[model samples]
Structures are given as structure tokens and as C-alpha cells.
Target chain A: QILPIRFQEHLQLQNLGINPANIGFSTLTMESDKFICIREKGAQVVIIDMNDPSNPIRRPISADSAIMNPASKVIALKAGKTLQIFNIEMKSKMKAHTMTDDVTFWKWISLNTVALVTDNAVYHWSMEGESQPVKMFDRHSSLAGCQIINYRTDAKQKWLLLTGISAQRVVGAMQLYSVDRKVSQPIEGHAASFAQFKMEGNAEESTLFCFAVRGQAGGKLHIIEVGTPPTGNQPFPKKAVDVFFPPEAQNDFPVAMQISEKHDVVFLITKYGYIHLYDLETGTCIYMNRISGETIFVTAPHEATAGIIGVNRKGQVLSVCVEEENIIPYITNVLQNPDLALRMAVRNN
Target chain B: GTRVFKKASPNGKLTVYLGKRDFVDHIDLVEPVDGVVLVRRVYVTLTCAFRYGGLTFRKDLFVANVQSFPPKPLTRLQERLIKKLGEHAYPFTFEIPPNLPCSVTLQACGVDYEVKAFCAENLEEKIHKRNSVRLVIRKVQYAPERPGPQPTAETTRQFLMSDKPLHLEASLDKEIYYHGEPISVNVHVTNNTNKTVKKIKISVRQYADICLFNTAQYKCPVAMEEADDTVAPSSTFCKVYTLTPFLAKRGLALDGKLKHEDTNLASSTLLREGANREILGIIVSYKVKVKLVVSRGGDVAVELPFTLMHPKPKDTNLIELDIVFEDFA
Candidate 1:
């Protein structure tokens, strides 16, 4: 009786004076793998470190939303057109930018740079010294009336992707932009994430961009390289694998995507709290299960465990990672594929 | 009887040697064929240019005559390869016409290039096949440096005083696509008007402009897909449809560089400077069409044109030539 889940942490929301009913899929920000940041009714922001869940850090800051830096104590707060960056350790204001239009969505793209999406345009604001928000490109007309949800950039920041959902068709609208050329192209997908993946035969790593969508036909996952391949480097083969949605979750769609750098796997979390683990190299679905009955609205990569951490509507802070020792046993006993388990263990090791 | 031999360098510089029939054309030339034979002419010809509705067994031959009757001066490598043969050996050089299409064999149609060396009594005399030696050659074009960026286009359709218009955008993942690789047409449709999209159809279309018969053109759909996703008014839909254009299907056009049993689509015709592109036989092109079957006035559509070709090989001359000394022995 081996278990694949290693961590399932639950926070005491009542003790911290936060009500679970007020939490939403969007209200809670778990963009940082290390900390879960939530915005409350009293202009309160609670930052809880996953490693030490006993003590919760609370800040009385007036903001519409807040996102903590992935690796630091710095937090970005935005209210209406006003945006500010503050460092908790130094307790000093870093940078502030007043946008012309209301910010529809914002995220920390890099340690010093934050991406802001407005109705008409997209901008990158760097928290570094003496830098203002710079416009990348105008939003495509197709994204009109679209609710912006996610923004991603390549490791080198050469390519950028912005994704959104509209009320009309339950379809995901996307626009990919090139920084060097200042051009934008439209893409069709629901959820997407970027990673640096080295294929089996390749000597150098390439920027791999993967997305999952459930359109009129069905659910599909596509993985492709972002830019021109390097010389003598074999690009990852373009993969289009079917993402199976269970019978119970017919109307469910993918909500968040997080790729584990250590395991070379992608965790696709859906609106029904179902997670699909897929091998990046082979597009093989390692496991799929419903960990919670409620929706998992937000998620971030758990760097230490090579897994994912997310908060459901019930305010249960759940983190699930593959137990390195139990992976082979679970696949062998539950999946009934000893050969595949041996191969996966040997190759990953 | 005198034997005429042909030797081509690895780089495709051809040389002609006249020797006795007894020599294998591989052995060293010991003696020359003793005869006062007039070296009337030597040339290369591209023949077997076939097409439909023309004379059933007809061929339009294009010949490039030798620069000089006495033969042009040989290169250092040509001279070095020529001395091994008999003293009576003569060298001639001729270049294929730039406008001629490369050697390609289609179903019941083809074009061929051959080097012919003839020793006739005079120009007026009919040259017999036995008195000449012909070697089949080829005129090929390798893939060139790709031009332009990935193709993308958008169109807005406003039906009769409609306040909100329908928007359709189509794009390709790459500018140049190799054969056997899938082509994904990323289509985005925003139906804000009162119209409802009944279906979406995408296809890879090929166009062949036959320069032969008064510029006749033909268009064929190589691969296609139809998605019956009904998108109503005040809603939007987006999806990526993948189409792989393969030659395994019947009646697909073949590339000019046909050296194998399996051939790809005719590569996009690239013309040289001052070349008569219209006379290049058949010019091929490809485009992806995205059509939205709307409920109201008409179907909204967008097209993204792209190139299909093979990457240029690492070595310039793909065919390795064997050494054959043409000498009079």
C-alpha cells in the first residue's frame, strides 16, 4: 500500500481570521512556488510560507490584488491604475507605475520585471533602478472582451505569451508576441506554460511551449519549440496528445499549468480539481486523479518536491508531489505496468 | 569501329574521349583509333518535355551547342583526366540552359537532359544513334535561403448595416515547412454580430500554373478538415487544425528533383534573374484556407500562404560521378 502524494498541507483559516467562503480561484495568488498570497476584504494580504505553515504573515495594505516574488520577500500590489512594488525585508518601496488604463491582469515575470495587461496593450515594468513601464505591443482585436488570466515569457524573454478566456464560447484566446520584432500572432488554447527542455538526442536545451485546450472537438495538448533551433541541436518533437476528461467532469476545463523542472513533468490542474501528470519528453500521462472535490483555482510549482501546490475553494492548501521512492511501486501495483515503471525510474535517475 | 567515351568530373565538368571499340573505357588508352574522322559537333540537350493535349508522343527538345567546333580549352582537372586517354581525344564544354526545368518524371510525363557527342561527315548529314554517344545528365535546383516571416492574416466581415462585425484571423506556425511535417492552421473567430458560425473548414491548397498551354492553371486541395462546431452570436471560438500534406495520396504533383520512388510535392518554383518564369513548365505554390461557415449573409474566410520545400543538402553536388576515361585507343 504505497502512496504517491507526499504532502497535503491544510491551513487554519479560522485561527488566522480569514473566512473560507470569501476565497475565490482568482482572489488567491499562488504564483510563487514558496508562498501563498491571498487578498481579503479589509485590504488584508496574508502570506503563508509552505515550509512553515504555522505562522502566517499578514499585511494591512490597500490593494485590489498582490503577488509575492517567486524567490524573495518583495510583493507587488495593484489597485485600479496604481501599482507598487515593496520589499518586506528592507521594508522600503522599490518602484511604482501609474497605468493609463485599468490593469486587467498582472504577474511577476522575472525577479525585477512585472508584466501588466491592459485592455488595449501590454507592458513590462521593471522594479530595477530608474525604469518605467515599457509597452510591448498593442493587444489584438480578437482578444476584445476577453478576461486576461496568464502571461508567460521565455527564459531569455525573447518570446511572450498572453492567454485569456471569454464569456462567449468557453474558448481560450491567446496572443504570442516577439520582443525582437515587435509583432504579435494569435494562438488557440485554454492553458499554457513555458519551460526549457532538452530532448533525448539534443545536446542543448530548447524553449518548449506547451498548452492544453478543450474546444468543440475535444481536449488536446500540444507541445512545440518556441524559436529557431540551435545548430546541431534536435528540437523537441511537436506533440499533440489527447487530454482525457473524465465522464463526471464533462464541462470542466483546464485552469492552471505548472511544469516541474526537476522531474521533467507537467501538472495540468483543471477546474474540477483533477490533476494530470504528463512526461514532458514522451507526452505520456503518468497519472490522473481527483485530489479534491472543489476547484483548484490557483497553482504554483513546488520547487523542492518537483510537484505542485494549490488552494481549493475550501481554503485547503494542498500540495501533491510524486514520492520518489513510491513512484515505481505505485505504477507497478496500481498501474500494473512494471516495465514502464522500471524504464521511468531508470531514465529519470 | 571507333568508340566514343564520356568522362564527367565529380563536380560535373564533362569531357569527351574518342577511342577504339575494344577499350573498356576504363583501361588506359594504348593507341588512338587511326582514322580521319570529322568531329562535327558536340552538344547537350534537354528533351522529353511532355504535357497533356500535345502530340501524344511528342517532345520539345532544347539543345545547347558546344561553344566552339574545335572544342573549348579544358580546365586543369579536365586536362589532367584527358591525357590518360588516347591522343585523338577531344574535350568540349556546354552548359545547360538556366530556364530549363530540372529532370523530373511524373506519371506519363517527364523531362530529361543528356550529353551527346556526334562525329558526322557534315552538318547536313543525319546523325545516327550508333555513331554517337549520349550520357544522361541532370539540371537541378537546391532549396534556397528562406524569405519572409511566418504568415498571418486577419479579416473583418460586416454584414449590411451590422453594428458589430465578425473577425476571423488565421496564422501559420512557420514561414517555410518541410515535407511530411504537419501544418497547423491556428484560427480565431469572434462572432459578435447576429450571425452564427455553423462550421469551420480548413484545407491545404496547391496551385499549379502550367506555362505550356497558354498558361493553364489548376488548383487542388491536398489535405482538408471540417469541424462542425456551431458558434452562436455574441460568442467566440478558437482552435488549431493540423493538416499533413503527403504524396501517398493519389495524383499529387511531384518535385522536379525526382531521384527516388517516394517524391514530395513540387517545390515552390524559384526563378533566377531575367529568367522567363512563365516558361518554367509548371510553377507550384501552396496556401492554407480557413473558412467559417456563418449562418447569415456569407462565409468569412482568411488565407495564410507558405512555402513547402526540402532543406538544401550539406553537399552541393549530391550525385557522385564515377571516372570514365574517353580516349581513342
Candidate 2:
């Protein structure tokens, strides 16, 4: 009777002087799943806590990019090689570090730590004490000539990944490194995320690496378990599902992905503003639609709803979540399948 | 070479032609096959049994009658093969019941299902072996309907002369694991006692129960590891030990449905409501054990039970990153 998905508009950016026609990809950052950081015009930086949508807090510091802490009110500001961490509550600087190499991209990996990716290596700068940028590991050669877009680490920080895309064929490359084994493997993909998923018959949850790409052969969404399974435990089955691309968006590629442990599904976003919801257990594509005409450049897992919150090029803060009450009815009426809906209802309930 | 099975009657004028010996139980339903059984009157029966030396546990699951020659309603395959079978081809279809137990073959004992056909002058007539044909068929169930949660446990041990108790927390990554995958147990030890922690031991324990008049039950450690990651007094320790549960010894068996798979760990058995418990067959389960040995006094341990079953049946149906600044770059 109703659509299972709801894409709600959370905020508009007309008052922040954010021009939709000239919005840059790195100008916006969503962290802690609650804060939205924006490097706006007139050397102004705006950070909004979606929890308090009307209050737009401003920081006086001028930086090329800014990222908020996931669990705190601190921010990491990067102005080329000079990086600064400041506490918004105290209105004071927490720490500052100058890098010999330029920081092309950076992110707040933890509450107190920020990961800075340079041309030759990656370093972590923590706001705790007087610690400077500490070198974690050198960048692998396979990442050369590619724009580093994202970095990820497992819950234990045992495994790390650096992903980027090349300019020529829009080819994607990923460098996966292991801290315990001191080894790295180069992979091919576009968008990737790390998840702790309980497979269908596993007694313990497995660390799964999910990625999607549209390369020369075709589009593919690959899901595989990382590391060795527990003793006597079964490893998750490696699966590769075909990705669909609208005929008009032939060159479109995936930009971001977030896994909802609550719903046991993956939300994949593309540059063409299309969203694909897939069940983690079966890799079944639950729903796919274009919610925005412009690309949704950044997204975070909605802490409140366990859905997804993102900002598109139109400066529209949008959120999409499974309408639990209507999902079964929608699947039965729209998808025209009572079998799948009942299976989902029974398993979830 | 093209192969077909045909059994003649005692009078040599009747015969039965059947193709395909294996059938699959798709959980909800299954039709074994359609074939020709020619005679004035013929009978087909399906039976299941657990046969042991000098003892047999049996069940008569299904039976059917083919009373007419050149039987009507023939399948395309039955019609194509019946051309080779010639005239007098009496066709019959036997639909197996959904709730029948899967075919399981074991070392000490076994459960099997078979299809038998024979001609009879009357319903009370004794059937002759020479006029009958029997085919062994396997019934299988894959991927159960529901899976469970991950295994987790925590315990506190307060030894004598200890200010605070030693806290131990253990958890597996998930609840149900597939075969060939290793099971990792995360053990965290916060020793606040005056005594030091000596060693850590992790194991996977499997329990098998034969539900019968006596309900024979037994347990064994399938996979184990001993780690010497000691934690001194007032210190904390955490580590993940990976253990693989496998059946290396004799007299151990996996689920009957997994007979064709390359695995040995017995799958955890779960019965649905309305299942025949008396003859519901063997039950199996598993647990992960984490034990911390103290410098002195009894060891502190935590056992978390978990399910070890096959992954969900795969559906036969088909289905990165980076930032940049410039508007078109």
C-alpha cells in the first residue's frame, strides 16, 4: 500500500551561501553520524548538528577542509600542509601539526585521532597530549596516480584500506594492508565499506568487505569476508552480484556505501544520484531508485533511525530509512511478492 | 551409453521402465518421477529405514497403484522413453511426502529411502523378487529457515585475598557458522586479583544426542587451543584465538543432508513444531569454551553455546570513494 523507503529532507542550505551550481566535493563532511561540516564561501566554515538543524555554528579559522569528531565537539581543520584541531565547546585549539609532505586528503578516524593521507605516506594526528603526526604506513605503489578518496580500518585496527580512482578510464584501485602480517594486497573496485555482519549460519559475526564498481567488463558488487574465520566456524560465502546502471548514466559509478547493522542491509549511492538497497544475507536487491537529480557526495549512518543521511550537490540534506511499518506491504504490493515480505517479516520479528 | 531400468514380471509379459534414481526434497514438496509399470495390476511403494546388523528401524512412507496398461497422462520424458519401452507402458507418478526424514548413511548405522515396484494379481498376493525392481533414492534438506545470534558470555571470579574480582568476557563473532570456516573466540581477561593469570585455553565442544528410549548423549572437544598470553595482577589481557571444528576421529558424522559435501563437523539439529520427536533422529549442538588459568586456585571459565549449521540456501535467482574540487575535474 505504501513505499517501503522514505527520503526525507532534513535541511536546506540557502542561508549558508552554499551555491548549488559551484559546490565542491570536499567542501562537505559528515561525521559522528550527527554533524555536517561545510567549508562555505567568504572564508567561513559552518558545522551543523543535524540534531539542532536551525543552529549553524561558525568557526573563525580559515581552512581548505574541515572534519568533525565522531563522538565529540572537536574539529580538524586542514589548510594545506598545516593542520589544526580545535574544540568547538571551548573555542580553543587542541593541537596543531605541520607536515613536510602535503596532506591531499584527511579524515577524523576516531574521536581523538585524525588520519592524514600524503603523497608518499599516511600519518595519524591525535588530539591527545602533544603528539604530532605519526606515520602509520607508507603508501603502496599501486595507489600512485590515483586520487585517494577514502580510508578504512577494522574495529581492532588490524586491517586498513586505501581506495582511489584513476583519471583515464575512471579505474578504481584499493590497497589493503594488514598490521599483523605486514603485507598489502591491491584490489580493483570503486566504493567500499567495512562491516561486521552475522552470516546466515555463523555463530560469530564476520568482518565483511563490500565494494561496488563499474569497470570495463560491467558493474559488479562484491562481498567477501576478511581475515580467517573462527576455528570450526564457517566463512561467509563470497558473492558477486551484477550491478545495474541506467542507460543514460553509462559512465556513472558508485561514490559511497553504508551498511546498517540494524536492518542487515547495504545502502549504495552512485554519482548519478541513484540508491540501491541490498540485503546483506542474500545479496538481493531490495529496491533501487533515483532520489536526487544531483549526486549525493557524502553520507553517514543515521544514528537515530539506523538509516542513511546524506548531502547532495544541491546542498540538500536528505535522509532515507526503511519505513518498517510499510516495508512488508510495499514489498507485497509493489514488488508483488508475498513470499519475500513474509520471509523478511518473520526473520526480522 | 544410454541407460534405462526395466524389470520383468514372473509371467514375462509385464515390465516396469523407470528413469532417474535420485529425487530432491525442496522442503515444501517433491515429485519423484513418472514411469511405466505394465501388468494387469501393479504396485509401487516408497520406504525409509535405519538398518543395523540384526536390527532394523523402518517406516512405510508412500505407496501407489498402476492398475491399467499403457497408462494415460504420461510426461514428455516418459512418452519419449516409453517409445523405446514399446507398448503396454503403464505410467505412474509417485509424490513423496514433504515431512520424510532425509537419507543419511553412517558407519555404525544408516537411514535410507528407496522406491520399489512389482506386479501383483491381487492386493493380498505375495510379491516375488524376480518380478520387482527397487531403486535407492536420496532425500535432502538444505539451508534451514532461520539462523540464530552470536555466542557471548561473561563471568567474574573472586579468589581469596583479592581486592576486586577477575572479570572474564568471551564472545564469538556470530551464532551460526558454515563448514570450512574457522571460529574465532575473543577472550578478554581483566585480572584484578593478587594472583597472576597463567594461560588461556579455548575450545569448541560438540554435543551429540541420539533421542531414543534411553536418549544416549555424549560430548567431545572438537577444536582446541592453549595460549600462554599471561596477565599479571592488576593488568588486562585480550586476544582472539581461532579454532577449527572438524571431525577427525571415527564414529563421528555430519548431517545426513550434507552427505555429498566435503565436511565432517556434525550440523546442529533443530526440530520444528509438530515434528516426530521419537523418530526425529539424532540431535547435535556446539559451544565455544574459554578458560583462564590462575596462578593459584581454580580456573575461571566461560562456555558460550552456539549453532553450527549450513549457510542459508543460496537463491537460484540472479541479481568507492574519492574527493575532488573542480566542478568537472
Candidate 3:
């Protein structure tokens, strides 16, 4: 019954028989069986079913940008200057709308609705509705970008929260469009760097907390509970702030920051190559490493793979993990952790 | 809401009834020692004695001749409610003393409280002690999570005949503590007077103010520790005493707190509002009264009022204060 305590070790994993060619991006499917990757052989994305291993299902689909709407294998792909809903379940695809500006990012608001962000406007699409896609707003001259925040569809609800930054990289707006014209709501004059909000629950109590970087103190992380949101000129009141210094050397503003779906972690990719991973709850830095490439992108789709699989234009498939400590009953690690204890003490004081 | 007092004597019939404003109602042995079968209610009274003794009852020593009250006629509300609860038990309300200490069970030197109920067993026939129907109740103190702040005190004064100002300061390690936990008292004396500081006395004074109708009582000490030496006239020396309040060690010195297993002292409980308005109105509060006996004419005294309540089960983190007393006296 007794096993050697230090027996918890392993061999260097053989890249799992993967295609060695450096791809722009690689990620597993939500179901965790099919290894769906992007830009394989410089042509298009490939879905390699881990079960078969030999045959790869290469869909005739290509896009400049995309997002997974886990309400099931549905992928919202943006190509050229338009957005399309590619259904792997039926092998059929349809354009979400007729757009003039390039569709930058898009997310599923519900089973029937999709929220799309463009260079100048925010678009809300209801596939089953009669009147056509609802154009929430066509404003913000300096709109950096916006992405869908929630993915839960158990109750026919997925809030559409997307943020955009202005020219000064200081002022931005979080636009929310819901069920009917998906109720238009926009929060303005908020700092936009590394801003994200994920649904804590899926019920009608679609309550949420938003975490974003402030403009001072090397960009401290600000966490705020988003109550009944602003739909007009009224801005969010004084907020609850949590300080986090993800970077020691402030070279360039973080170009991209994505929080995991579980709300347990976040991935921060800086313009100058340093990517930081932090525990969302305690703001503890989980991992810190650099990518030698200038154009780098990091994404952690925890539902697909618990590790962050990122890529760069410099020909290296960068895989960043949390050291993978096989700890049991992780709940106690909060009080037992030396760093967490200090943060907990400072939070109370 | 009515509380029924029910105690049967194997053979039914003899009963008692009591109500609010009173802890107990009446006591009658329908047949005494195989005698009665006659009239009831003549002249009878019960008593509650808090004693501190050992392996047995501290009958000889009493820590508190606690509160007691005479039975009164039932009220109009009482009469209406009792019609259902029946005679086997009397509908009465019981009051817990606001200042009653924590209940303790010790073997030899027992520290506890006992309420005895009995009427004329031969007009006090040498009082067989054991014949009294005794219902033992324990008074214990429960500490809050972070019971406020630590208790401390300080003062300064000059000797009458010497004109030199002598200073004394004292502080407790904690505000609230347990019965057996060691109490650390830090006493600092800066002797400026030509009169040398002689000795010091630390007494945990337990005051029993029985709020009975219009009367009250005092002068019951739960524990005391005193030992000394000399502190020079022109210097300052801090003496630390790790004192343990062994309740039974000085049993006879207190209002006998009853005991059970090992000889012990009753831990102090909180002063709470109760059922009996008068009669069982027992209240107890403790303070570390420190007095330094100097060589000359006067004495320097520092009284640190602290609640010596028992501890709660979850967490009472044994926190110790680094620097206690600051001033002169």
C-alpha cells in the first residue's frame, strides 16, 4: 500500500506526435478530444481528432480572427470585412451580417444572438429575428477592440460585454447589447488597457465583476462589481480597487490581456514580449516568461486545455503552463500560501 | 412561555408550582419518611449554596450563599397556562445570575455551585446534607472571538513622609482568560522616593452582588497570589509573575464554588439577564487588584479591571502583549 513519496515524476513529453511546422496559433477543441489548430502549413486551420491520430479534418474555412462560442462546437469566424457563423455540427456556414468596416471580434450573446465589434461600431445579431442585426452604436473614433465575455447558454442567456479604448489609451467604453436590440448599454470614460469581465454565474442574476488595468502605479488591476450597467451618459461610480503589478519594467502597454473562462486566471501579453499569467482570485503571479518574437498572441481557453498555447511570427510554438504542481485539496492553499497570506492581510488592513 | 418544574417522589401526589419573577415555587413531601397523608403548605424554604471543595462536596465552605426567593401565588396568566401543563410539574420561570462564573467539575478541591431543595426533615435534624434534593448548576464564562482589547492600567504618586514621587505601573497579558490558564502580570516600579518598594500583591477579586429585592452582598475573592523582594530607591525593576488561579487551593477563602473531578476553581461567566427577577440574583465580576507595599508611609496601587471569562471552542488564540504598562503608578 505504500508508494515512494517522490515517485511523482515523469518523462519529457514527446510533443504527442504533433505537426512540427510552426503554426501561428494552436488550440484544442472545447470537447478536449479534437485538437483544433490555426494556420497549419500556412494555409488554414486543422481539427485533428485525438482519437484517430492519423486523419485530420481540415475545414474549408479561413478568417483573420475568430472566437469559440462554447454554447457547443460553434465558431464565429471573421474574414475579409465580414463575420460568419461556421457550424461544425452541420458543416454549413452563413454570414452574420453585411458589414462595411472590418469585423474585429465577435461573441455569442445567446443561442440566437451574436455580438460583433468593428473598427467603428458595435453590432448585435439575432439569427432568428425579423428586422435585421441591431447596430448598438457607430461611435468611438479610437475604438481599440472588444470581445464577447460570457459563454453560458444553459438558460438562454450570455451577456455581451465588449470594451474599446480611445486615442490616449486612457478613455474607453464597455458596450453591452442584449435580448431586444439586446438592450443598449455603454459605460464610458473608463481606462481600457487589459480590460475584461466574465460572467460569475449563468442565471438571470447575470451579475458580474470586471477586472481592468488602471492608468497609474505601473497599471494596478482594478476589480469592480458591475451592477445595473449604464445605458446613457451616466458613468460607473467610484469603484472597488485591487492593486496588481504584473510587470516590474514598464516598457510598453500590454497589447492583449485575456481572462480564462473559469474566472480563475488571466493571460497578459505585452507589446514588448513579456507575457504574465496571474491567478484571478488573489492576483498572484502564476507564471512570467518572455517571447523573443515581436508580434505575439497568447490565449488560454481553459475549457479546451488548461495550459496557455500562444504563438509568435518568430517560428516558435510557445506553450506556457503553471508549473503543474499536482497538489491535493487545493482549497487550503489560500491560507497556507505565504504570498496569499500577505495579500489577505493587506486586503483586510 | 411557561417552564414546568417537575420532580416526582416515586409515589405521586406531592407537587410544586412557580412563575415569573421567581426561580422556584414550592416543595412538599405528600408523605414524609412514610408519615404524612395530611395538610400541605406550612413553612418551608429552599437554599442555593455555591461551594468550592474537593473529591466531594464543599459543604463546609461556601463560595456564594447565592440569591434565593420565597414562593409566591401564581399570576392570572400563570393560572390560565398551568391548567394544561398539570400538577406533576409547576409552571415557573428560572433566572440565571448575570455575573455567575463558569461551571466547573473537579474531584478533590471542587469549585462549583449547588441549589438544594427540601422542607423540615425533622425541623433541621442535625441536617443530614445528603437528604436535600440537590440540583447542581455550573456557571461558566465564554470568551468572544476577539474579546475587544487587552486590559491594562497605570498610575504615579509620591510618598507622604518622603516627598519623593514614587511611580508604579501594571498590565495584564490579556483582557479575558480561562480558569486554569496562567495570568502574566507585568509590574514596573520606578522608585524615586527614598522609601524602597517592599512587596507586591495581585488578587483576582470576585464580587458577588446578589440583587435580591433591595438587598446585596460582597467580599468574595476567587483567587490571590502574593510574593516579594526589594526594589532599590533610585531605579526601576520590572517583576513578572506567572500566576495560576487554582480555585480549590484557597477554597475556604471564597464563597464556596462547588467542584467534582480534580480540585479546581470556577471559571467566570458573563453577567446575563435572567428568568427569576429576584431571589436567585447572583452576579460576579473580577479584577486584578495590584498593590505595592513601600517602606515609607503610603502605598502605590494599580487596579486593572478585567473580565475573567472562559473561552469559546473555535478560537481563542493565546495572544500575549509585548509592552503592557506605560505610566508611573
lDDT of 3 by residue, B189-250 (tens): 88887777787788777655544333344545556777776778788878887676656532
Better of 2 and 3 by lDDT: 2
lDDT (Cα) of model 3: 0.44
What are the per-residue Cα lDDT tens digits for candidate 2 across B1-329? 43455655556655666655444443344435566665536677667665432555543444455444323245545666657555666567666665665554433444566666777767678878776766665554433222355667999988776558999999998775676678888888888888888998889887766554344666778888998889898999888889988765434545443445433466565566978865645566788989988877789999998766543222110000001111100
For every candidate, how close is chain A to the native chain A in TM-score?
Answer: 0.92, 0.92, 0.55
lDDT of each: 0.69, 0.71, 0.44
User: Mind giving the per-residue lDDT tens digits that candidate 1 earns over B294-321?
Assistant: 8857998988888776533221211111
Q: List the residue pairs that clash in candidate 1.
A: B17-B326, B18-B327, B18-B328, B19-B327, B19-B328
Q: What digit string (tens of lDDT, one per residue) describes model 1 on residues A1-349? A: 6765576754434323345655775567877667778776626777866543323576776787888888787888887888888877677777777889999998888777889899999899887786888998899987888889889888889889999998664889899888888788898888888888776667788888888989887988888888778887976689888899988889888888888766677889888888888877667777888887888777877767878888888766777887788877877898887877777777675
Per-candidate interface DockQ score: 0.00, 0.00, 0.00
Ranking by TM-score: 2, 1, 3
In angstroms, the error of model 3 at A286 is 6.6
The alpha-carbon deviation from the true structure for residue A205 of candidate 2, after best TM-score superposition, in angstroms, is 1.2
Candidate 3: stretches off by over 4 Å: A1-22, A25-45, A48-54, A59-89, A93-97, A100-102, A107-113, A126-132, A141-159, A165-206, A214-216, A228-248, A255-298, A304-349, B1-329
